Amino acid sequence: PVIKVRENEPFDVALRRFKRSCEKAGVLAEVRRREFYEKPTTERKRAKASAVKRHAKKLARENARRTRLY
Amino acid sequence: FCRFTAEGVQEIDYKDIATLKNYITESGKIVPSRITGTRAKYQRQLARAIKRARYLSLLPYTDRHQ
Amino acid sequence: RKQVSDGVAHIHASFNNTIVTITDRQGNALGWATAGGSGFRGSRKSTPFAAQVAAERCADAVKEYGIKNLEVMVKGPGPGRESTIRALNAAGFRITNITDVTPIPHNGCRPPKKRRV
Amino acid sequence: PRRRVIGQRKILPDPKFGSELLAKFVNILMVDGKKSTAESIVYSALETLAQRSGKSELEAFEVALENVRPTVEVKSRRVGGSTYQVPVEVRPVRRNALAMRWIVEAARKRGDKSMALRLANELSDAAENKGTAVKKREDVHRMAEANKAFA
RNA sequence: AAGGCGGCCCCCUGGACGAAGACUGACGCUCAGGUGCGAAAGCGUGGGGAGCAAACAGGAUUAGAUACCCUGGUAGUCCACGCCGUAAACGAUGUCGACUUGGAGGUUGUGCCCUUGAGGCGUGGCUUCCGGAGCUAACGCGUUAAGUCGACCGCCUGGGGA
RNA sequence: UUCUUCUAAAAAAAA
Fold this sequence. Notes:
The structure is cut from a larger assembly and holds chains A, B, C and D.
Chain A: E1 2-4, H1 11-25, H2 28-33, H3 40-64
Chain C: E1 6-13, E2 18-23, E3 29-34, H1 48-60, E4 69-75, H2 83-90, E5 94-100
Parallel strand pairs in C: 1-4, 4-5
Antiparallel strand pairs in C: 1-2, 2-3
Helix pairs in contact in C: 1-2
Chain D: H1 20-29, H2 35-53, H3 57-66, E1 72-76, E2 85-89, H4 92-107, H5 115-127, H6 132-146
Antiparallel strand pairs in D: 1-2
Helix pairs in contact in D: 1-4, 2-5, 3-5, 4-5
The structure holds two RNA strands.
């Protein structure tokens, strides 16, 4: 994530652009993921659970879109 | 919204650096299929082409290795 | 002390401490300061304020080289990810380029086991 | 408390000078509801403070108070496993309350003959930037400075 | 087929699926005993050893701490050839075949209509979630059945002992 | 961040 400050540009917006670029490229998440060793069974179970949630929330939203609360 | 199925190209050519650069980030990483909308078969072919180019030093592995 | 106009700032921002090192464009270090060596220890030394004070100390400790321009190389995750960059800008340096240089293996060596806290 | 932030209650000002915070001072100084005795003590202390300062009693009281008012204080948070003394800025009403309380507690510890004399000596030293009240001020400031890393 | 398999290139090679036919003509399904494959740890011989890390040592926490946490660290993890043949070896659901409402996807062929752009209409293989009848002690399964049937095999008869 | 354990006897309604 290289960010070269352009002419007539504030430092704070440059820092914000660098932070945005970093979270886009995902370096913090990658290092925190590789901080400790994760067993293949654990990562498979985690990915499976993540997919279950990512599908359940969509279905839950679809059901909630029909009914009303008052 | 896959460009490769739109042009109906048989197989992705690894020497086509000009088109390949549009599917990589500034860090050199591969952009996910769910973002760029490419079909899975062409996504695999595209990945193979990008790796072949990296081996051939036509594309960077990372933005920092010098 | 041979005067140098422009330099590189390496920020080794770990979880437990942060190290700031100013150098020339060829990698020869001129001065350094750390949060752990800036009068902070334990819980205090892993905070952005301790990091900014460390950055100020390092910037003060390199005044005799007369550096004006500076490009930043940031490495590692920490609380002091950007506060040191702020303190360096506020110390009177013209930040030209900001780069993240955090090393990530391409599935290389096996990391240590997960802490059972 | 939990549900409602109560509305601030009114306090009538002192009879001799019409000041609000001086009336607050006599309220803080009073013990066992003897406001008359407390009023006599503060009036005598101010009357001798006027001589030692050469300025009016309100101005002398205020300049003495300003050297005792803090601007940051530590408050316990304990989000981590240990006590986290977080330095937080102090609002003006609480600043005045802390200053007056510190002055009163310092005067109650001095060894002079009368409370009026104790209060007068404490106010003069505070204006002169000395005493245990300003010592307490520097101590809390030093603590907030040492723990400034948490915010 | 299961265990399992993740950079790129080459050599040798197994299986699966699709569209049109042509061909042999029940040659089929299952299988006690038998044989082969079979994660990880472990064993033998010969190498290799960066990171990780049983045992072990030191430092903490604690009333104690032969542990959890920290710093090191040896077999092992890696390669070649044999041995061992065990797992929550799991879909806790043996294999093969036929029939029984549907919906939204993922992945991989293929036919037609003007591909009047990434469009529309079918028809196959694998696979995920929801659900009707029906079944089930319930939870749930629900054309990839735990529904309705047929062929064969293995297994169970109170808990502990085991 | 650490925070262990409480032996050994109960009674409950029947149109």
